Amino acid sequence: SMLGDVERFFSKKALEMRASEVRELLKLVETSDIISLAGGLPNPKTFPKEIIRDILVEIMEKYADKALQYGTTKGFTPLRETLMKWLGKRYGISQDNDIMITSGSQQALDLIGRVFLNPGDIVVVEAPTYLAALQAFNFYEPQYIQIPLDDEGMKVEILEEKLKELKSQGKKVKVVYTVPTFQNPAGVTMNEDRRKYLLELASEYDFIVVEDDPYGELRYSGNPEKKIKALDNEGRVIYLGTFSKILAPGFRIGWMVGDPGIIRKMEIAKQSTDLCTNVFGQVVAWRYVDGGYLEKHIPEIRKFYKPRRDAMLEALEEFMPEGVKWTKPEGGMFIWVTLPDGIDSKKMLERAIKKGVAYVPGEAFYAHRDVKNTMRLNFTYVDEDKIMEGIKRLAETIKEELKA
Amino acid sequence: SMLGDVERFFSKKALEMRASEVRELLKLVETSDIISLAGGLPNPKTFPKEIIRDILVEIMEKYADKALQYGTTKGFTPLRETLMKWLGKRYGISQDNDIMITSGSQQALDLIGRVFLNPGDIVVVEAPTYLAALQAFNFYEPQYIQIPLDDEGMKVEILEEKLKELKSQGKKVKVVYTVPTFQNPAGVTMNEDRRKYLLELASEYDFIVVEDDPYGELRYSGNPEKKIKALDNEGRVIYLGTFSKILAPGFRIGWMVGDPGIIRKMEIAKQSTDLCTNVFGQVVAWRYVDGGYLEKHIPEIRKFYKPRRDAMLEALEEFMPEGVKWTKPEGGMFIWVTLPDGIDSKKMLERAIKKGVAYVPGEAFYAHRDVKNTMRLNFTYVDEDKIMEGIKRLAETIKEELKA
Ligand SMILES: Cc1ncc(COP(=O)(O)O)c(CN)c1O
Ligand SMILES: Cc1ncc(COP(=O)(O)O)c(CN)c1O
Ligand SMILES: Nc1ccccc1C(=O)C[C@H](N)C(=O)O
Ligand SMILES: Nc1ccccc1C(=O)C[C@H](N)C(=O)O
Ligand SMILES: O=C(O)c1cc(O)c2ccccc2n1
Ligand SMILES: O=C(O)c1cc(O)c2ccccc2n1
């Protein structure tokens, strides 16, 4: 810096901000010849570019001043209205909720931390959970409680046990943060009984549930789950969705659905961070949904990703040594791998990269960073030939790591 | 709320957030047939729509996957390169700076608070200053020092006095926030001597200067000022600009230019708030600049707003009673009026609205909310006939208020 010790100006929170040896390594990987399974990018082959083009023409013809002018903090009214109808009809979400549009789902998480979290408040997360929710929440200095997943999602029984111990210490949970369908990073889905069980606990222990669902329409097998938000008679769930995986990430449009008193506060919080989410992208999204394009396109997304998931699953089964394990997602973008014999996947990344493959080490997906033998693999955005090849290079990497 | 006392969940900061009685009133006024001079919107007649339409076609033809995919947190590289070349050539801003793209300049204000402000840190603002900068900064609990304006902008001599008193109390300013050209809300511009004086003080007292410049290209008379950032040999100025007034607000693209060490921290801070500013809009803004459209369009903006400023100034001169004073901006969107005889402009708004005109009371533009006889008038966004008739209704309101 040209100010020398520039840190002399930084806030306490800025002084704690660092980022991040592995994320920086993976940036560089993403630009080389290596087969990277490490990214969380949807495949641009799934962007509906013909529909987008017609919508932009329509906007410049009919909606130009609306698309181009400042919008309200709450969002573009027709998008808010069309989303609530879509969510009501498609998922059974109650029309008693209000809705705010956000600058992607990530912004919704920062706003949840601003609006709910005092330093020290306790936040429950899955172990693993979505890394950038931890990063959003960390600015507000929560304490975390981690609840492990299994193949049917959050072990809610362990949450009840941790809630009872917290009670015995005179403490309680403010927010339970869940990514219950095709989790990023785990791929697994919380079963129906556990969603209802979670809501019983939310009532009994008086907490808010944040249900963050980017991946739900990316279903390749099985039957649609019930949104936790659909089961929410008390108004304790805040539902987050986003256009990122179902339209394209580049518009940065998301939504938050929940109790009107919560929504009002969230609106006031957002107002000073950005004025409004980009209205042009909101107009695009409104046409995308209201003109029936969203519904028609989702089947093409699913058709595109399904074989990529299947390819990756098939290569894992054929190439991996005993007893590596992996999840078997019904949808979404990710497969989550556990290594045997206490291998540390973060240290093993060097070896993988030398063999031409990359993945994200799972450690940072844990609030307490205490699990070291996991990896997140992405099947949406590397060439399908390179999925088979990447999995083979990974499998050989693990073989070598396992000997002396 | 469905949760009863929903408050029980809110953070300390969220408990201290409230909607404004005046802003809510003004919203309702905008939807009515009153002549409102209270808004801060640019005129959609100045949005370059035919150019925007050509850019949108070109993006779908050649840049679709870039415009639609997630982008890096720092911003779209070509936009960042083009902006630095533009700011270098046009303003003489040094190429030793870095740049980050933001979701409007408003987001840059929130990021400045996150990155520099601990509770209690001292921020200097002009009196008046831009309301939503106070709102952004307020989440971080600064103490403010207010420095009055005159017709040549911040009275930097009063700043020196206040810096000396602070020093005598063993205290320091961390940030000086300035909107030095065609101020929102005052309309005035800091002269050249004061820009250099401010930088001498920044050096002597070791603070950072935030130079927030949405309005610079909206010049109607006079000669271009020197950017404070263009005089910045020490790397102490963070320069903010935005496409909102020179393209259209709806894309929500802004930029922050300053010392590389500062910009790296800001990038890390931003990452978890929104991932990236919407890339689609960043592609549009890149073509808008790089293809020469910004430069050709700026003269049309000026040509459009100039007569509107002039009509408002003529009407003020003809209709206003003795004792009323107003600024005489060389550019921008706003004229700032001061009432005689201790009239309270917030209590007078009631009477103004009954007479068919609205304005924003100046009180909220003061950190300490301690000046009550001021008003911000906008001339960009209602029509020229309505400016004359609005100023007349305002003048008659002031006359009535002056009795008995
Ligand atoms: C669980 C989770 N939540 C939120 C997000 C943020 O996505 P966006 O901001 O693009 O809506 C992601 C990334 N798609 C995610 O995986
Ligand atoms: C002084 C000032 N700074 C920042 C902004 C926010 O602008 P935007 O977020 O649209 O760049 C405005 C409104 N144009 C303003 O008047
Ligand atoms: N490359 C990305 C781009 C955008 C959003 C996420 C990613 C990811 O890396 C995966 C997961 N979203 C994460 O936090 O790790
Ligand atoms: N946050 C506000 C609330 C009310 C009135 C003004 C403001 C502002 O910050 C000025 C802005 N240019 C406007 O649009 O009025
Ligand atoms: O996105 C990130 O900022 C990121 C991603 C990772 O995979 C990490 C792994 C270990 C430590 C920090 C990490 N940070
Ligand atoms: O004096 C006020 O009550 C006042 C006036 C305003 O213009 C406001 C604008 C935005 C937010 C709060 C506000 N409060």
3 state SS of B254: strand
DSSP SS3 for B217: coil
- Ligand 6 neighbourhood includes B21 CB (under 6 angstroms): yes
As given in the structure block, the two tokens for residue A331 are 């949808």
CA distances from A250 to A42, A45, A305, B280 (A): 11, 14, 19, 5
Let me know the angle formed at the C-alpha of A338 by A334 and A341, rounded to the nearest 5 degrees: 165
- Is any atom of ligand 1 closer than 6 Å to the C-beta of A104? yes
State which residue of chain B sits closest to A233, comparing Cα positions. Answer: B2
Residue A272 has its nearest CB partner, among B19, B136, B259, at B136
Same domain, B196 and B254: yes
What is the maximal distance between C-alpha atoms in chain A?
68
Considering only CB atoms, A114 lies closest to which of B14, B132, B135, namely: B14
Check whether residue B158 and residue B285 sit in a common domain.
Answer: yes
Q: Which residues on adjacent β-strands are paired with residue A150?
A: A153
Q: In chain A, which residues have their Cβ closer than 8 Å to the Cβ of B208?
A: 9
Whether residues A50 and A163 fall in one domain: no
**CATH code of A253's domain:** 3.40.640.10
CB B173, CB B207: distance < 8 Å = yes
Show residues of chain A in contact with B20, CB under 8 Å. Answer: none
Domain end point (choices A230, A262, A293): A293
From A270, A293, A316, the end of a domain falls on: A293
The burial of A342, by beta-carbon neighbours within 10 Å (0-12 exposed, 13-18 middle, 19 or more buried), is given as: exposed
Asked if residue B113 and residue B4 are part of one domain, the reply reads no
Minimal-distance CA residue to ligand 5 atom 2? A23
Q: For residue B257, what are the CA distances in angstroms to A273, A275, A289? A: 19, 21, 37
**Same domain membership, residue B320 and residue B198:** no
Residues B359 and B300 in one domain: yes
CATH number at residue A364: 3.90.1150.10
Q: Which region holds residue B240: left if phi is over 0, alpha if psi is between -120 and 50, else beta?
A: beta
DSSP-assigned letter for residue A154: E
Same domain, B357 and B308: yes
**Rounded to a whole number, what is the distance in Å from the CA of A396 to chain B's nearest CA?**
32
Q: Is A244 in the pocket of ligand 1 (CB under 6 A)?
A: yes
Q: Among A79, A43, A84, which residue's Cα sits nearest to residue A246?
A: A43
Domain end (from A260, A293, A326) = A293
All residues of chain A having their beta carbon less than 8 Å from the beta carbon of residue B277 are 252
Ligand 4: centre distance to CA A114 (Å): 22
The rounded distance, in Å, linking the Cα atoms of B309 and B288 is 26
For residue B215, how far is its CA from the centre of ligand 2 (angstroms)? 9
A56 contacts B64? CB cut-off 8 A? no
Please give the helix or strand (H or E) that residue A147 lies within, else none: strand A143-150
Q: Closest by alpha carbon to B335, among B200, B206, B232, B182?
A: B182
Q: Are residues B213 and B111 in the same domain?
A: yes
Residues of A in contact with B47 (CB under 8 A): 64-65, 68-69
Number of domains into which chain A is organized: 2
Q: Do A318 and A403 fall into the same domain?
A: yes
Ligand 1 atom nearest A106 alpha carbon: 9
Domain span including residue B100: 69-293
The partner residues of A144 in beta bridges, in order of sequence, read A123
User: How was it solved?
Assistant: X-ray
Same-domain check for residues B62 and B73 = no
C-alpha A105 to ligand 3 mean position (Å): 12
Is there a single domain that holds both residue B179 and residue B314?
no
Q: Which of B43, B46, B106 to mutate to test the pocket of ligand 2 (most atoms within 8 A of CB)?
A: B106
Nearest residue to B2 via CA among A111, A237, A270, A100: A237
Indicate the resolution in Å.
1.8
Strands (E), B297-392: 325-326, 334-338, 357-358, 360-361, 374-378
| Pocket perturbation via mutation, ligand 6, pick of B20, B25, B371 by most ligand atoms within 8 A of CB | B20
**Residues A107 and A219 reside in one and the same domain:** yes
Distance (Å, whole) CA B383 – CA A5: 52
**Kind plus residue range of the DSSP H or E element containing B146:** strand B143-150
